[PDB]
Amino acid sequence: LEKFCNSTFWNSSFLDSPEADLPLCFEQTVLVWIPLGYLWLLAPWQLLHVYKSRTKRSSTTKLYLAKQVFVGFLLILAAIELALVLTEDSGQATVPAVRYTNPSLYLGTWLLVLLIQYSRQWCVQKNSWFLSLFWILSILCGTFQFQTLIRTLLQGDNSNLAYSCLFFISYGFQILILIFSAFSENNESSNNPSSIASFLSSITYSWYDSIILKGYKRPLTLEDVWEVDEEMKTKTLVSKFETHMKRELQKARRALQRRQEVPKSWLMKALFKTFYMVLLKSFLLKLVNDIFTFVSPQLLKLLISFASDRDTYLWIGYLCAILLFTAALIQSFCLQCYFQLCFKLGVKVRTAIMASVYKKALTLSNLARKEYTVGETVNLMSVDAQKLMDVTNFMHMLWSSVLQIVLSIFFLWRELGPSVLAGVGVMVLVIPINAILSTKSKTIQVKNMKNKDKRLKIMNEILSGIKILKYFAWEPSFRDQVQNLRKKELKNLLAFSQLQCVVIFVFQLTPVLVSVVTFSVYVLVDSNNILDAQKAFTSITLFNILRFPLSMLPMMISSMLQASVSTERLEKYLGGDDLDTSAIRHDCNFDKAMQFSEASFTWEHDSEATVRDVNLDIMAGQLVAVIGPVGSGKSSLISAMLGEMENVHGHITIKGTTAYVPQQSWIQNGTIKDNILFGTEFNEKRYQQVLEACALLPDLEMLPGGDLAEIGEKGINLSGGQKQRISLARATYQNLDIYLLDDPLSAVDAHVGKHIFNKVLGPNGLLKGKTRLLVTHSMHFLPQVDEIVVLGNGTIVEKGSYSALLAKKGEFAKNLGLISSVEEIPEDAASITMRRENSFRRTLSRKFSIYLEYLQAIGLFSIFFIILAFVMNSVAFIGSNLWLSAWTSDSKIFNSTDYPASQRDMRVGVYGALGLAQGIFVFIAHFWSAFGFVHASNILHKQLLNNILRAPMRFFDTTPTGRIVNRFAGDISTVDDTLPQSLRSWITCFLGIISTLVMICMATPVFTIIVIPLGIIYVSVQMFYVSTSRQLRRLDSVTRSPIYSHFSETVSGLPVIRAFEHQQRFLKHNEVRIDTNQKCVFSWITSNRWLAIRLELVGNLTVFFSALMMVIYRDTLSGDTVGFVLSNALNITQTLNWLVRMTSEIETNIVAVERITEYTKVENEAPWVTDKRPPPDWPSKGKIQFNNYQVRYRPELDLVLRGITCDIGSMEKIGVVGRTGAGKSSLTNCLFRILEAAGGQIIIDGVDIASIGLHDLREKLTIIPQDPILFSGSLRMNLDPFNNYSDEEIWKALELAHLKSFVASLQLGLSHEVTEAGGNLSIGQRQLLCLGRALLRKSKILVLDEATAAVDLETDNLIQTTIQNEFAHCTVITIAHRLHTIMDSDKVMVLDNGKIIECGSPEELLQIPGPFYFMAKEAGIE
């Protein structure tokens, strides 16, 4: 190279000076060879890759011509430079070839740049990574030439000016070209801008931000979320996975058959063989990032060394700061891309498993299907697949730990020595302790869950039946009855809370402990050891680096253990056998549409044949009926026709299609029209005919929505009579060839059955040509059939026509969130794991004022002290660092053989004391925090319960029960579980950040300036993220439940699905429903990565400046002062991301307190007890009177009852009777003050009901409930919750009620338990018991109602007479509809539309014609 060039390649004199620079020999050689090599070496492929995939050229845009003209300018500039150089010196001038090759080289390269750019015009991504990286390499290499050239000229030499000006122009044009090579230049494809995006946009995610702007202004819906790429569409992933699954299983089955004469491991392989490439790429990226994790500490040590002494050069510090900035930037850019790749792979695996499970479900054999449960398979897809997604989101950790740890350990020893082991051991002993406490926490949480479940069950009953409680005034008892359970749960909650505090304490103080032990052991083990700043601060940095893997490796091992059993379970279902179909021949026999050649089928595998030796044939257009006894096997025969049984001997010939009407009707979710259509083009000449013939017209008219009324699990639940007619209508509208009806006229009555038979299926009906096979139990329609068969014991006994069988004279005669892994937020490694586990376990079972309110519930007195403790801990932290910074500074004064013992002891005793103080203050803060919450949950729930239990009926009527009960279950769980964890983590993160900034600003009072700008950027970048992520969190939940709903529906109705041959439609529906959720998950997976690049950039900028500010003031700075500032600021990048993410969860979770508060402040009704007390034995006589009583249910609604003036005498029986909508039932709800008194008043015993207190009036009144309701518990609780009576008087009551026979001979006496609404008891005694309930009170005024409607005749009679025999010295008012029953009333009151009309004796009312007489004439009682 010496003869090629003219100057020396490298000499110490070039450097080793205040001013130092590489010569124009090293810079004009290697620095102009690296950039060219990258372009030349890796061009061919980047042309082969374009050559094979050449498509249509894209329209030309201004950017293209600009990029082409700038390169042309470069070309002409290089050409003119070469010409000038050649012309300058030709004769007697041995010009070095550095002036010949370099010019020519560039001229050669620019040509390739022009060509490669044109070729890109024929691909999707125009600006790829190749050129974008080339330009950066060129600029970085050419900055050095620019650095020296300028100096040479500035120094004062004028020898070379053309070259400098030429080089300067080129360097600029290069800058401009790089700037132009970043614009997206989009084709504006509505699918997604991810495919069309330059390198820089696709590496800083500056294309998602459009959505960030769209969601900030207005709420965003499913329309404006970009669709997923084709490579991820469900249809594509399945095929790819299916190929390898099919290829593997067969080999696994062969291996299992060859040996041991149910596969063992195939799923895991099928996944690796399908997705190895993404694994390889992610592994490479993770390996590259793993390197930067240990690069920083070396630059930090270099900074400490440079700042320690004084006789150095500034360039060293400036270069080190620039290198630190660049390393941080590169590490962040690589890490984000690795995260994106891994999470995308996880989503792909989850979709490819869920869709494949769904596709198998509808082709599995009957045996395996009957082995499983309907909910079990849904839980299988909803739980197993999700578990596999997690173990594929964090697998690379396994290898990225055993390596990281090793590397870290190596650095430590080279830095300190064997003392390091002391720290590691203390950092290893923590994990064992952590386990003993997790097991205890789980043990407590199990009983917590059990007691919580017991509490909610009583809540549901009282909320649903709030009417009966109000009538009998039983509210006070349930208060304490539920408060007992509340306290019993609260004690366990407090125990669990204080246990969780010990765990956070050990994970919180471990950094200081390891530091005190390591430093003390190192300095005290040998007198020769001297502590210096570089070693100490670098050791701290490596300890902080190593602290994570040793704490995530335990978690990863536990997760893989769960995924093992999850995989094992799925492989049984996805590898199950298929039903056999080599028994039904779909041939066009034509001679017959059915043939049985001595068939014999069995339900089980090899058990007894349910159908044995059956042989029959029926021609087309023949209606034949199959009859027999119970358990004969008809439905088994029709299922064998469908082919749902295992063949044993014989074959069945079927011509044409088939239609099925199952005995147990199956109804989907949706409108009635959708169910009737069942995937068919809508018509008008047939739809109307079907609905009318099936007599589904009158009922449809009565439905609230008519034809478009939502039916199914989440809608009107129809009865057997209707659901059967809907199924029959669907079957008859689909219009197939062969109909197999299984008892379709059982739920309907005689009229509807006759109409359907004469209009739909029969001699003259819709299906008059198609063959019909009907199974029946009624002999009413037998004469109108063609042939009948009598099945017996699974075989045919007699087959013949109606007349023939009757003539045969035999048997017939008698017969007729937002978190994906624990690597993204490593500090909160535990809480995240617990939340996942809790959610998985819970799946199986199934204006700043609110912050002030929650703090007031907690208690501000304790809040002040807790904040004081946390703040004091931060001060003790900064204090310890300054003591070390002083301790490390101490070394320069002394030497190896001058260190005294007193200094050695003093420099460590104080360090130990400060560590102890830090530990104590944290422990105290955590100790109080736990209690400060258990009290909050108690006051919030108790306060809420008393208020909600006292609300008037309006509120209970307007709001659905579901909303009210959810607050008592979900919110209370949220307010006492995750809430405290986040509320206690956020303050720790904020105080850590604040403490770090005080330290840097203290050392450099100048730093205070940068704080303001960063804050404005931080709080700005912050609002944006939350303003969008919150909305996407909701969309995801709304677009998930559908999938599991669909799977449950198809699994339940498989035979009907497979009888109609309608599987492709359902597969397509499932594929669409999966692609809707797969589109929404990615939209938040990308957003999290957007925030990171922005915040990691901010966090790296705030440390770059600090470093530079300590090089311009280094004259006044020591080596240690440049240690505590950088050693801490090095970990401020990720803490910002953690704070934003954690403050985006606390904000979403505070919604719980808000809801609870609204119901705690619901309007209340009149006070229960007032000072006005009634005279003793107030209801002495039954004297009621109404003075123009007028009332309205709600203020916005009009008066329902008006102008009421009647008199009620003592010991008088009154019958209230009227028309519909006359307010008869309102009269009762007016005597118990359930409503108010818009006009008039009610006076009883001379005392207006208003004056008497609420709970003081109801006690002395009795009413028989309209719908007898029985609460859970024991028989004593239903009869007397208040345990006021004794058993003796109770035992008399059942004797009067004719129920002592049942209760005396029961399993127990009065202590027998009852299930829900008395489910254990039968209907007969449920209505009877409520009679006895009211009997015990033996009040004076009894308000009866029409509640004997479902009471059986004999029982009814008993009830009627019982009333007369027992209630004689009392006043009885009865609202009834049995006009006949109303005959003995002393006065009969008549209501028309809310006005008293006739008041007289029934004999007088009938003697004189009138509205009552007209009603009796219509009724015909007399």
Ligand SMILES: CC(C)CCC[C@@H](C)[C@H]1CC[C@H]2[C@@H]3CC=C4C[C@@H](O)CC[C@]4(C)[C@H]3CC[C@]12C
């Ligand atoms: C790794 C690089 C890129 C960044 C780190 C800073 C580099 C440029 C610095 C740090 C320490 C420096 C060395 C320190 C001491 C000497 C001895 C002297 O007689 C010749 C220069 C030499 C050998 C220096 C060369 C430049 C150097 C290696």
Ligand SMILES: CC(C)CCC[C@@H](C)[C@H]1CC[C@H]2[C@@H]3CC=C4C[C@@H](O)CC[C@]4(C)[C@H]3CC[C@]12C
């Ligand atoms: C666009 C970027 C990449 C250019 C980077 C190089 C710049 C920042 C550097 C490289 C060489 C530097 C020059 C080197 C020497 C001198 C002479 C001195 O008496 C004043 C400063 C001055 C004039 C420096 C100014 C800044 C400078 C021009």
Ligand SMILES: CC(C)CCC[C@@H](C)[C@H]1CC[C@H]2[C@@H]3CC=C4C[C@@H](O)CC[C@]4(C)[C@H]3CC[C@]12C
């Ligand atoms: C590594 C890449 C990314 C950045 C390169 C930055 C280079 C061009 C910069 C960084 C620090 C700079 C040096 C800082 C200080 C001095 C002392 C001055 O009297 C002469 C110039 C000199 C010696 C500079 C030369 C150019 C320099 C080395």
Ligand SMILES: CC(C)CCC[C@@H](C)[C@H]1CC[C@H]2[C@@H]3CC=C4C[C@@H](O)CC[C@]4(C)[C@H]3CC[C@]12C
């Ligand atoms: C070049 C880009 C990429 C990085 C930025 C580097 C900056 C911080 C560097 C590059 C050139 C440097 C300057 C080069 C020369 C001098 C003259 C000297 O008497 C004081 C320092 C001073 C003024 C330096 C300050 C720091 C400096 C401006």
Ligand SMILES: CC(C)CCC[C@@H](C)[C@H]1CC[C@H]2[C@@H]3CC=C4C[C@@H](O)CC[C@]4(C)[C@H]3CC[C@]12C
């Ligand atoms: C140990 C516990 C009791 C500490 C309590 C700390 C209090 C003061 C903290 C915890 C949660 C915090 C809130 C969390 C989120 C936000 C949203 C942000 O846009 C404005 C500040 C605001 C509204 C915070 C205000 C201060 C806050 C209420």
